C-alpha cells in the first residue's frame, strides 16, 4: 500500500492472503464474507494479457495473518479452494469491468480473534455512506512503492472517496458504474494509495449508525501508484451484490 | 457465517478504538 502503516494486530480480521501454492508466492488479497466464502479481484485469477490463469488448485488462501512473511503456526489458517466464481461479464479486455471473483473454500473456517467476516453493504448503508468526502480504509501486503519494497506486515491507509467527474478525468480508461475511485486531490496535501499486489484487498467503511465494518470495494486497477492527480479504482461491491448472491445460495 | 459480521473481537467487542478508526468517523460528521 503506498504511504500508510503497520496494521494494528487483529485490526482487519476479514483480510485474506491469495497465495500461489508453488512457487510459494503472494498474488493478492481477499476478504472473508462468511465462513466458506472469500471475495477477490477476478484479474487476480484470470488476466490473459499477463498469461495469468489459476484454477482452484494453483492457489491456497491464508486467513488470519500479520506478517507478509512468517508462517503464523498458531494464529493463521492455510485453507484450500473448492471452487472459483469469476464474474461472467468481467471485461478484462477493456477496463477490467466487474473485476469481481468468489472462491468457495473446501471446509469452513473457525473464527478467532484474528479471523472474522466483513459485511457486504446494503441498499441504505451503500447509499448513505458512499459519498465524495467520506473515507474508507485500504489494506494490503503489496508494493510499498510505485518503483524502487514490501511490507513485513499488514499496511493500512485511509483515503477519501472522489467525485465521478474527477475520477473520469483522472484517466483515459472507461470508468463505469461498477467502480469508484478514492484518493487525495493534489492540492489536498496528503497521500496514500493501494499499489501492485493489493488487488482483492477490501476497501471498508465503518457505520456511524450501527458501528459495523462494511466492505464497499475491492482493489481493482489504477495507473502508477500515488501519482499526483491520479486516483485509484475500486470495484463497486454493492453494484455487484445480486450476482454475489445468485451464486452463494445457489452454489 | 456472518450476522455477527463486521465487529472486531479485539476492538468493537473489547470496546477499543483502533488508532485511526476515528479519522474516518469524523470524515462523515465533519
Amino acid at each position: 500500500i503506498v504511504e500508510g502503516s503497520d496494521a494494528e494486530i487483529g485490526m482487519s480480521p476479514w483480510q485474506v492472503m491469495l497465495f500461489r501454492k508453488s512457487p510459494q508466492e503472494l498474488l493478492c488479497g481477499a476478504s472473508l464474507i462468511s465462513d466458506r466464502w472469500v471475495l477477490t479481484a477476478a484479474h487476480c485469477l484470470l488476466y490473459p494479457p499477463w498469461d495469468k490463469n489459476f484454477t482452484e488448485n494453483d492457489l491456497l488462501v491464508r486467513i488470519g495473518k500479520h506478517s507478509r512473511t512468517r508462517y503464523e503456526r498458531n494464529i493463521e489458517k492455510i485453507s484450500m479452494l473448492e471452487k472459483i466464481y469469476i464474474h461472467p461479464r468481467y471485461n478484462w479486455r477493456e477496463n477490467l469491468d466487474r473485476d469481481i471473483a468468489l472462491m468457495k473454500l473446501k471446509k469452513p473456517v473457525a473464527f478467532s480473534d484474528y479471523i472474522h467476516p466483513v459485511c457486504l453493504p446494503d441498499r441504505e448503508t451503500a447509499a448513505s455512506l458512499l459519498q465524495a468526502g467520506y473515507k474508507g480504509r485500504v489494506t494490503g501486503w503489496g508494493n510499498l512503492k510505485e518503483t524502487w519494497g514490501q511490507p513485513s506486515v499488514l499496511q493500512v491507509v485511509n483515503l477519501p472517496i472522489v467525485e465521478r467527474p474527477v475520477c473520469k478525468d483522472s484517466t483515459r480508461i472507461r470508468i463505469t458504474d461498477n467502480m469508484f475511485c478514492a484518493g487525495y486531490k493534489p492540492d489536498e496535501g496528503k497521500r496514500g494509495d493501494a499499489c501492485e499486489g493489493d488487488s482483492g484487498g477490501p476497501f471498508v467503511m465503518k457505520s456511524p449508525f450501527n458501528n459495523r465494518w462494511y466492505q464497499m470495494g475491492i482493489v481493482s486497477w489504477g495507473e502508477g501508484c500515488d501519482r499526483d492527480g491520479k486516483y485509484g479504482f475500486y470495484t463497486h461491491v454493492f453494484r455487484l451484490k445480486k450476482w454475489i448472491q445468485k451464486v452463494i445460495d445457489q452454489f | 457465517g456472518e450476522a455477527d459480521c463486521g465487529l472486531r473481537p479485539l476492538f468493537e467487542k473489547k470496546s477499543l478504538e483502533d488508532k485511526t478508526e476515528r479519522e474516518l468517523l469524523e470524515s462523515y460528521i465533519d
Binding site: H87, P88, R89, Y90, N91, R93, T176, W243, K246, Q250 | -
Partner: protein
Amino acid sequence: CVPDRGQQYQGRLAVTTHGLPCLAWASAQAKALSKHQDFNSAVQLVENFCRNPDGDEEGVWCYVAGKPGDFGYCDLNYC
C-alpha cells in the same frame, strides 16, 4: 437512433464490434454465462442478436464465447 441504451432493440445485429459473430443467445454456454445474471424479463433474447438484458450503460452486447469476458458490444447508434 436506438434510445435508452438500446435497452429495447429487436434488430438482428449479430456481430461484435470487432466483427465477431454473436453466439446464440440461447447457446449452450451463452446459457452458462447467462445464469447468475440479472436479465430483465423485458429485453427479449432473440436468437443471437445483440441485446441488453443487463442495463449495460454501454449498450447491447452478446456472448462471443464460453469463458468470462468472451462477450462484446454491438454497434448501434443511440440518441
